[PDB]
Amino acid sequence: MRLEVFCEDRLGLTRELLDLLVLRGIDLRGIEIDPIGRIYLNFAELEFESFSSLMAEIRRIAGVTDVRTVPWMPSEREHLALSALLEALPEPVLSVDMKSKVDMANPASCQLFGQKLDRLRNHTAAQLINGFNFLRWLESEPQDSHNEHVVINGQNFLMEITPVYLQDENDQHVLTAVVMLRSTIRMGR
Amino acid sequence: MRLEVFCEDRLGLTRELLDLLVLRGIDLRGIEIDPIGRIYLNFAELEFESFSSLMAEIRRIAGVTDVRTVPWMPSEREHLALSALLEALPEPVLSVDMKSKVDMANPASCQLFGQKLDRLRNHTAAQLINGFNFLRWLESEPQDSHNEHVVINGQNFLMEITPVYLQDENDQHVLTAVVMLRSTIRMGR
């Protein structure tokens, strides 16, 4: 949850806000400040009730002119736009580290394997996809991308695998051979 | 200027740290807390003599076990790791906003359209790719992905454009018709 607090230029206002979060059982994840007169607050979802009296309570603080909920902290905005677009990808995307452990994985990567992100992230890559040697490839210090054909839950896909940053690991896409043929026909004069 | 402060889990530390910076007149922009027990500070540039005094006084706050400058906030490390996935993707990827203006684009895209990313961002999608009404499709309130065969600089592509989030634009993926056949031909062995 992200709050934006509008306030005048007053001594001690930021402290009195953090005290208030502490009094109320709320553990702070982030606070950002705009010199113009805005304070953003990051903490875990409140239930609706604790939420509304808190807003009211923040508005009573000396120097606060207004509060609202906002979709992101200034710090989150761009990396959330990046995540959104990668999560939107209609087919499986997912990244792995140097130990080939799954890191980033999109919704389709989850639905195909039939599991939520946090279990899926517990896997190395060869545990999820039969037929390829991830760790020996990532050991290979790779230049180019790799294309392999794989079957996953009895389904034909093409898997492409590309190194990431020096070698901080790799990311890879999967495309259904069946979806490709249906979709290259999405032209029929 | 960014610091990382390691600290024991003691009541009042974060706020005492905030009081310190308020009092030294430090132009604090951001704090991020690491669920472990690490606090990151982002503030405007200090002269060297003050940065030093600051870091010295911080290391003497009770319960602080260390302080060090760091190149990035966690949010910024996250942004970097997501930019790196996007930029590694072998084939063109871009996103566009609700006016179909280009927001992000990977190097594969910069290379295709022959423009550095800065300039790519000046263009609507229909200024870069013929044979698709991007803006019209955006105003359709699309739910589903769309595939279109497009020709870009005389090279044939299958184009999949997908809607992003609570409609904020779209993700575009272009795959060469020819690399696909080559890959599905290789898949035969």
* CATH-assigned fold name of the largest domain in chain A: Beta-Lactamase
- The CATH architecture of the largest domain in chain A comes to 2-Layer Sandwich
Radius of gyration of chain A: 23 Å
Main sheet of chain A, how many strands, which sense, barrel?
A: 5 strands, antiparallel
Largest sheet of chain A, order of strands side by side?
6-5-9-8-7
Structural class of chain A: alpha+beta
SS summary, helix count of chain A: 7
- How many structural domains does the protein architecture of chain A include? 2
Extended strand count of chain A: 9
Shape of chain A from CA axes?
A: elongated
CATH class of the largest domain in chain A: Alpha Beta
Distance between the termini of chain A: 50 Å
Counting copies of identical and different chains, the oligomeric state is homodimer
- Helix fraction of chain A? 25-40%
Describe this structure in words.
By secondary structure, chain A is an alpha+beta fold. Chain A has 2 domains: 1-81, Alpha-Beta Plaits (2-Layer Sandwich); 82-189, 2-Layer Sandwich (Beta-Lactamase). Helix content of chain A is 32%, strand content 31%. The first copy, chain A, has 7 helices and 9 strands, in the order E-H-E-E-H-E-H-E-E-H-H-H-E-E-E-H. Chain A has helices at 13-23, 48-60, 77-88, 107-113, 117-120, 134-139, 177-184, and strands at residues 2-7, 28-34, 38-43, 64-70, 93-96, 102-105, 146-152, 155-164, 169-176. The first copy, chain A, has a 5-stranded antiparallel β-sheet with strand order 6-5-9-8-7. In chain A, strands 2-3-1-4 form a 4-stranded antiparallel β-sheet, with helices on one face. In chain A, strand 5 (93-96) and strand 6 (102-105) form a beta hairpin. Chain A is elongated and about 65 Å long. At the A-B interface, helix 1, strand 2, helix 3, strand 8 and strand 9 of A face helix 1, strand 2, helix 3, strand 7 and strand 8 of B. Strand 2 (28-34) of chain A pairs antiparallel with strand 2 of chain B, so a sheet runs across the interface. It is classed as transcription. The entry lists the keywords transcription, aromatic hydrocarbons catabolism, tyrr protein, nucleotide-binding, activator, ATP-binding, DNA-binding. The assembly is dimeric. N-terminal domain of TyrR transcription factor (residues 1 - 190). Chains A, B: transcription regulator tyrr.
